[PDB]
Symmetry: C5
Subunit: 250 residues, 5 copies
């Protein structure tokens, strides 16, 4: 049971905070200008350790050059850039076997349901899922419907669809976008069934209070917790705010 | 002879009712709003068992997290979403070998004859068929002509073509759409030859009677039975109606 | 020498008649309405036997469910539908190794020279040819230029091109379209060199005498014989006409 | 050193004449109407032997059915037709290992630099090159820029680019188009470095003297020799003209 | 640690000059007309050696026919032409295992982030990276955003993105385009973290002084050095200018 392994490692207190840091490929270093220390992966690991968070998410290159075993690692296997303009697609730049050798306790993979290339990711996810079982590493699916008929990505029915697809394809945990309110988000949590749901943190909010409120409703909806990047490390008071998030979530 | 194994497991009474539940990925959870318990796979298994049905159809993730051995399982290997807009294509997210380990007694695969991508599914079906023989698991093909010159999916000649394609490609059993009357549907059944035909239930009918009459025409046409989803679990009297279906079919 | 093996099995009398029956996938069951027994593969095998023909052509599913060893089998490895609208392509749904296990004495494969996807079929034919040598099964190529600059598939220069391409790619025997007269067809036969040529029967002719004249022309051009489907089994006097064909060819 | 092996087998006199005969697939049998014996590969082989040429180029099907060991063989691994309309692409229909078993002393492969599919042929050439080294067979690259920005295939800069690409990708010898004069062609020869250059013969010239003047210029430019097809076997005085070519080149 | 192996071989003096010569496939021989000896890979090897440069970059065919062990080799595994017109893509024509047998001390691979085919190169890079680790050969990534939304390849934000992508995908060293000034380029160097950055030399500058100034700024920005092709071997005084570059990079 890989969900149970995931919960044991990443949610020992019953809830989870994962510090996400795949943004260097997905968005590029413009994300790091607000708080320049955020460009240094060593600063990120220190933030995770000092705030008492459960994990970090790195791409293979960051894991290879910087990962030191100090916080449980989810190795994000695929990645794309915002420079890309086609139908959404993100392919693996790392195998599960290599993730294991880099010290990962879980692997991550993004799918874009609805994309003209949805099939390419489902096909590749099949191989990754099989390897995840073989190496006994939980699979965490970033389920982000995009392209095709998707217009609003945070619409209640799209997020619920995202959650269900991750369950159906074999996710042991999932990361999905927040709908903006606990009632509609709890439907997504419900259709995910036994698979725990992490809220994606999203763009830095106008105030810290706005994000604490989002996180409050995420927990009320029954989610396991949050996978947060920008709303922590884009802030110059990153550590202070991270510890307030820890207080709220645990 | 894998047709005979299929009949022994899924049609021990001489006719078959399979409760289909791949809808989480195919349509998403909007299908589950009419009868919210339908979002829970545990509820689906209870329902199948209590109505005395012959099997359930799950995607790999639902099988892994929920399947308990209580009703014979057809593991549906491929899936796509309705969010997708390209030429119809659905790729495997699971192998036959993995289906075996999840407790499947048969595997399912959808083809869309006529699609700009028909070749991609025929290519993949070739590998799945070979594996099905190797692992001695019957292959059930969902034969759904779509894309290309397909303008009307329930037209007599399209359904008959669907049925014949499934036979020609190596299906041990098949699932196809109803034409709306027993005379035309019996042509589809005839061209399928030794391979048994299950009617796809389709959208929830206006009345329960309408669906019973379809079912009385399907059986008259010489089909093995039905693979039904929505017309059972979308109804709040799901168990009562399921038992009426069992009475009629068995 | 696989051509010699082909001739020994399928042309023991010096000429050949092969009863083709891959139409169920290629054209669908509308082909079977004229003579409804033609939908039954058992009837096809009895017809081939009773007329004293040399072989039958089945797709894998028909071979698996119906082939009984009573007439030598050519297993047609690839297939496409008429529902398909793209640039012509037909991919393998079966391997040579599986054809061997189903009792085939030869394998068949269609190429569409000129298609936007000509390369996909040449690539796959390379693998099939290599396996045909390895399993010592003659490879029979259906050479049907289509797409690209091809307009009339029966023009003398197109049929001769078809024949030459089959020879160059390694066919041990080939099936090509008739040009409509023995002089032009004999050029196609000549450029095929040591590889024997079977005439594709084509659509059911207006009279029996018309088809018989085509066959005579084919034999005068130096072809090995005919691979005929519709002009035999679409007729309600199928067996009687088949025996007249046998009289003419042998 | 596979270039040295190439020169030992195909250029024992210090210069080389190769009789090319892949035209059956590339152009089809219309090429053979001028001199109908040219359609017979046995005639081609006799012509090569009687004129004292160094080798022949055959596709796999011709080699398998006709090659008798009498003249060194270059097995042309890839081929396309003129019926094809897409961006130029030619895929392998044969492996190096099979070429070895057919009696080849070298393998040939066409690339079309500039094509929208240039990548598909570079990817495949990588595998063929690796195999050629493993089986110790020289790789002869037909370097024919086509598609993309290429509009004048015989332009000095295009032919020089063709030559250099073949060197960079690992060719042990190469075949390229003539620029029409020795000065510009000698630049292509120079950028090819240690890799010997064979001139592609091209369409049959108006006079035998026109062709001899191009051959003179190719020799003046420092090329190894010619790979000639049509300008020999499309002529009814093929043998006589072939012996005049031998006189000039050797 | 393959970055450390790269630095030991290609940067023993603390900075690096690599003489790049994959241009025969990428641009074709028009690049060689200015200084015709440049078409001869032997002249190139003599040039790197006589100027005391750290390495050369060759495609497989040049390495097989000409490489003589005299200067460390980076085997550039993929290549495309300028004749090509589609969305930018460059596929491997050589494996890491073959590079090892040809005498390479490192392997090079170009990615074009933003291309409609970016996924094809990331997919292939994954296999090459896995083989580089297996054969213990440093992977040098040419990170050149092109296609998609990219309209200015030397814009500060594009170059910084290029640098970060190379780090994220597993590069042990990288080659990226210069932004034209040391302040913006130093942001690219910073986001590259522990992975060293080599400046791509670019088109031959109008004066030798212009190129030196670009190199000065690259060094000031904290880069490891330069991978230069045209700005050396396209010049008739190639050796003299190469030695001035050596003075500036290893010395200045």
């Amino acid at each position: 049971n890989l969900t149970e392994k995931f919960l044991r490692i990443f949610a020992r207190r019953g809830k989870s905070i994962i510090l996400a840091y795949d943004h260097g490929i997905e968005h590029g270093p413009a994300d790091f200008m607000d708080n320049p220390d955020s460009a240094d992966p060593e600063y990120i690991l220190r933030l995770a350790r000092d705030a008492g968070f459960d994990g970090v998410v790195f791409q293979r290159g960051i894991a290879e050059k910087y990962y030191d075993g100090s916080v449980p690692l989810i190795l994000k296997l695929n990645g794309k850039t915002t420079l890309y303009n086609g139908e959404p697609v993100s392919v693996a730049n790392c195998s599960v076997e290599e993730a294991v050798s880099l010290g990962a306790s879980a692997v991550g993979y993004t799918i874009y349901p609805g994309s003209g290339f949805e099939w390419k990711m489902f096909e590749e996810l099949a191989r990754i899922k099989r390897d995840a079982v073989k190496f006994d590493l939980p699979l965490v699916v970033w389920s982000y419907p995009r392209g095709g008929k998707v217009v609003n990505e945070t619409a209640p029915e799209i997020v619920a669809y995202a959650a269900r697809i991750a369950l159906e394809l074999g996710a042991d945990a999932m990361k999905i976008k927040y709908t903006g309110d606990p009632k509609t988000f709890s439907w997504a949590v419900k259709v995910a069934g036994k698979v725990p749901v992490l809220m994606s943190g999203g763009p830095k909010t106008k105030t810290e209070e706005d994000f604490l409120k989002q996180v409050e409703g995420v927990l009320e909806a029954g989610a396991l917790g949050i996978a947060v990047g920008r709303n922590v490390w884009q802030r110059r008071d990153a550590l202070k705010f991270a510890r307030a998030l820890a207080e709220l979530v645990y």
